[PDB]
Amino acid sequence: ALPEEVNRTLLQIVQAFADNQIRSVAEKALSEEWITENNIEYLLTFLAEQAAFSQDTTVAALSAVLFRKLALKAPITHIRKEVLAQIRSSLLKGFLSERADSIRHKLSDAIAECVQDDLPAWPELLQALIESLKSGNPNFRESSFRILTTVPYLITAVDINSILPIFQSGFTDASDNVKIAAVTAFVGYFKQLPKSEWSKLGILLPSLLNSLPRFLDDGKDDALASVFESLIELVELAPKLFKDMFDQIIQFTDMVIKNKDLEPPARTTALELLTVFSENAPQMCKSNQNYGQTLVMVTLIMMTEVSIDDDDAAEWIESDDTDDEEEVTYDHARQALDRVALKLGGEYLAAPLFQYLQQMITSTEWRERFAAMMALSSAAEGCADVLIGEIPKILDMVIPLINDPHPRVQYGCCNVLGQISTDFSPFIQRTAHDRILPALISKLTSECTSRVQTHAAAALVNFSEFASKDILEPYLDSLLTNLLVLLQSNKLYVQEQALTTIAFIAEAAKNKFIKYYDTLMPLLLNVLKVNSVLKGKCMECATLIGFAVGKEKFHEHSQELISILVALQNSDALRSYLEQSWSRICRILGDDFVPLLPIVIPPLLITAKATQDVGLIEEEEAANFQQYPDWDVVQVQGKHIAIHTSVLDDKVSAMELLQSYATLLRGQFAVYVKEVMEEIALPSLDFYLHDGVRAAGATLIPILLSCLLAAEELVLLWHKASSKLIGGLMSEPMPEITQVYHNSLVNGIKVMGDNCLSEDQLAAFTKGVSANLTDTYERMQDRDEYNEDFTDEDLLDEINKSIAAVLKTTNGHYLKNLENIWPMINTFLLEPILVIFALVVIGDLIQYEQTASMKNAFIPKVTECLISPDARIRQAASYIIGVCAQYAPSTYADVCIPTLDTLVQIVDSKLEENRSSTENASAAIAKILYAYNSNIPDTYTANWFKTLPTITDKEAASFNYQFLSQVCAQSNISAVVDSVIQALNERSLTVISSVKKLLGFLPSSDAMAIFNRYPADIMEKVHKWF
């Protein structure tokens, strides 16, 4: 169907694709001459013909792939109809002809590119698929489901009474390949189509579930694993679909995992299946005692699968303190238990968990005594809500095993005491130190095995992290003499652990470690002067001891230590110990670090200038790129991109250190500000492939400015920085980042002061604010038959801050710009999060009688809000009514005095949750009483009074005691005073001057007696107040 010349030109080109020369010439020819408005359809026509008809595998394959790629880019929609049709017809004839399997696969994928919403109907495809599904050739059946997977909309197009049997036969097909493709197609439908379409295939789920036992009958567990993977996707999409056969699937996964002649894939995916219900349907799991019971049971079974064929654990005793990556099911079981416990709570799982543990702790099989320890370790955090109270009980089970004949059970027990020191902190440190420490300490002796000494030393890190110096104090000498022994090990990992454990114990001990400094420090210096991680962990230990004992003591070895660092730095795991150590010395040395900046800063400057290392990449070339932990690939705007992730993580780390030097050294860091701002902070906002970088760029901004301030350029840099921040608001996709930019502007404004913004900036900020609010609304009006966002609340919380901050810097002038997004604001005002936001904005508006334009638009809702069941709404509401009487005294009276009774009732309240809201109302009424002073029908003020003291909201308290400073005589006097003592002592707020005058009006003895109620500690404060 092409001119014969064109054919062998194109044939030559495509054949050249499979040498540099012949192949590059073809590549240029193709991309520069043939993929153009004029030749595109010829090219597509050619490639479709080759894929359809070529007798050569390679040419057919390549053309199928090329066609697929180019057909998108064209795109297929702007192709002439006569040519689309010819392409379609040959593609279809190719599919139905005799091709090798992999070519049929590629044809299927090519065909899919020719089916489209806007594209003319292709009912010949529909017909071809239906017939192929009945073919006696598996590859035809498989390939048809593949097309239904690529183009799930075709499933909508086929008659419901044809498509139903299609899938039922599919699930039941004698070919495994066909089954997997049927299942894949079936789930893909839900992946791709709206939920309103789901109910139409939903009904097939039981046939699918019913087909599952056949995989175990034929012994086809690998294919079972693949189906489990599809089913895992379906659970995440429509968990409730599973409700009616929930017990059946639970029981099935149970059966699989128990059969331990099966290979791991079926078993791990089956566990995953079970696990994922807790993440997507927690109420469904909780409403069924069976789920919990099965899930605990199976993970306990899998956790025992360790040191197989090695009862002494010889191999484990002889290795380092890392995981044996061969123990896969054991690793999976821990993670699963952990994940479900975190989702379901202890309320639901502790009982079934413990039912088993009581028994496994007592077994003669060591593997089960171990399993017990590791399971508790996995579940402890998730079950803390319950287990935090059964702490003596838990230690009673665990601690007796610390001395188990088997070293792995001992390690296991170490592990639990470690895990729970973290998960029940800080309560466990306070109450079980007397049992935990001796237990761990006893394992440290060189009598025990290296792995056990090491793990006990590790668990002392967990414990130390949350133990006060006073608790650790009596145990230090013993802890230390033991760890020195571990320091003398032959095994690199024991020394490494020893060092870190000492470091962290020293960190917790603080000044209590001063007496150990002289024994430790020289042992450490000797190690250093002599093995990279050793030296690093050693420098880490030295500098953390330094921070513990303080600068004066640290000064006995600082110069020598410093000289060693220098030698070490200028001589890759080590690099990170070095950088943190310098950083810790800066915290010790204070301003005396200044002369070290030339040594420490340059390396960080290099790393923090790292560029977005991106490789524009091809489909195939991307999953093996993905294998590396240090790389990731995404699809951004149509293309495939390879990004070097590690490098960008390192950029962040370096940015964080520069930020922390800047923070501590203030004015002394100024010399670096211009450079870090222009070469690091700002360019980092444009790092669209890594959000950490973007955020780290943002937080660096106000801190850099503030350094330069403390030491005109400042005004330039601020203008540049603010403008890119502002610009970022309207382009930044990620809500979490958007927040950082607003916050960052707030902090910038705070630094730069009065009138730090220009008119265009104020306008460009408004657009940003609006696009941010628009996209929040859109995401939120999306939140069921099939299924059971502080990120949003937090963003709006910060937007409030920036607006307020912008208002303040403009000194009101931002009212003008603020008007344009009033419709936006208004929608919000009339879903609680959006309401609170709107109210908060309006309170800021009134702060700057020019708002009458809107009195009518909001007081109806505000008055409503006053009596809302939600405390946060009442709070913001009352503040608004109070701010009305403060800044707009007269354009508001007809409202403020009526509502005043509402406020006396909202007041009645004094409880943590709403102490704040009732304090705002209290302040709100004091504002009204001020503005319209001798105009009120006065019980009121004596009501108000009984709402004192104000202890929680600071700005409220600030007004109430200002108003109190403008009740007399009587025996209100002790309530007058205490009202103030309480505010002061609670640190919530010259009202003192006023009080002294009242006490002046009474004798020596009458004056004194008021403080008679007050304890010593607050009488110390009172003396220093009056």
């Binding site: 690793d331 821990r334 993670q335 895990q419 967990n462 870190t500």
Partner: peptide, 8 residues
């Protein structure tokens, strides 16, 4: 280092 639980 420490006692913790991975997640991979």
């Amino acid at each position: 280092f420490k006692v913790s639980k991975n997640s991979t």
